[PDB]
């Protein structure tokens, strides 16, 4: 696959900023608390957040845009199976992947 170039690390700050933007994105921003959910490391193996993943897009982490993709899918992944498919976390995670996905065929 193709090297993130410096134009599309351009590109990626502002897919992540746009994400980070959404109204929706707020239990994304920041790793979960464990005081607000003192069995979430216990469940999910492999926590992510849009903060993290704004760490590693500063310090050019992401070799490849599958690796920057497979970052964000887990943050879905992981509350879709943290949480009931009918909690206002689940809706979250549902609406911010479809403007993702939306997001991402634009930057290509
Ligand atoms: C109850 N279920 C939950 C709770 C939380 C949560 C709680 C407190 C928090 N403080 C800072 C972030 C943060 C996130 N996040 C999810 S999530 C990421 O959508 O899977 N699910």
Redesign the pocket.
């Known amino acids: 696959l193709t090297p993130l170039t410096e134009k599309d690390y351009e590109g990626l700050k502002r897919v992540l900023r746009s994400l980070q933007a959404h109204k929706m994105a707020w ?7 464990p005081n ?2 003192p069995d ?1 490391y216990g469940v999910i193996k492999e926590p992510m ?1 849009l903060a993290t993943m704004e760490e590693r897009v500063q310090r050019r982490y992401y070799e490849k845009l599958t690796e920057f993709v497979a970052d964000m899918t887990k ?1 879905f992944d ?2 879709r199976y ?2 009931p498919s009918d ?1 206002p ?2 809706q ?2 549902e609406v911010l992947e479809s403007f993702f996905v939306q997001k991402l065929k634009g930057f290509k």
């Open positions: 239990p994304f921003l920041e790793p979960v608390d607000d959910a979430y957040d943050i992981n509350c943290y949480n909690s976390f689940y979250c995670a």
